Amino acid sequence: KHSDEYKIRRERNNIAVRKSRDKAKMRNLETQHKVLELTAENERLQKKVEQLSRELSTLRNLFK
Amino acid sequence: DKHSDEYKIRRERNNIAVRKSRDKAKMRNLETQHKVLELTAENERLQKKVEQLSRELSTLRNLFKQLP
DNA sequence: ATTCTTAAGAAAGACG
DNA sequence: TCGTCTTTCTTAAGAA
Numbered sequence: 001k002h003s004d005e006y007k008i009r010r011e012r013n014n015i016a017v018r019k020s021r022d023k024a025k026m027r028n029l030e031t032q033h034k035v036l037e038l039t040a041e042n043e044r045l046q047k048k049v050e051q052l053s054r055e056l057s058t059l060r061n062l063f064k
Numbered sequence: 065d066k067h068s069d070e071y072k073i074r075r076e077r078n079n080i081a082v083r084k085s086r087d088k089a090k091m092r093n094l095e096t097q098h099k100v101l102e103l104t105a106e107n108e109r110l111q112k113k114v115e116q117l118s119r120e121l122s123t124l125r126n127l128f129k130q131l132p
Numbered sequence: 133a134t135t136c137t138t139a140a141g142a143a144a145g146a147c148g
Numbered sequence: 149t150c151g152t153c154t155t156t157c158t159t160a161a162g163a164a
Contacts, residue, residue, distance in 0.1 A: 014140080014141065017140080019152090023153095031093070031096050035099050038106075038107055052121055055121060056117065060124070075158085075159070077135080079159085080135095085136055088136095
């Protein structure tokens, strides 16, 4: 309506909708962050597995 | 003018496009959430493999360095 | 020209 | 009752 309680309610709702959308937008980028971070660590751990396996076979050929 | 029939068709075409694009995003978000779980499981499998090999390599060293 | 993507506003419940 | 938060529908502007 042409009220004034309506105008303040619309303004407060617009504030609330913007806040709720920016919050939900970061939670989706936060999940996208974890994908790039877990892919970083899983590739570091995979290099560590190869490193340890290499040194185990180097150490085991001392038996020859 | 600005409420022609070109306006109605364009706005009805855009409504269909917004629903299609919004459905793709929610799906793309849901696939990312599932990627996190399988990467977490793989991260746990790799951490346990590292510790297993770390203990195996440690014990094998202690044997060589304890040579009389 | 089009479709696709993004941000915004409005209204209705959900919630405390 | 009041409030804020969350969700659906739609529009408008701009990117592709």
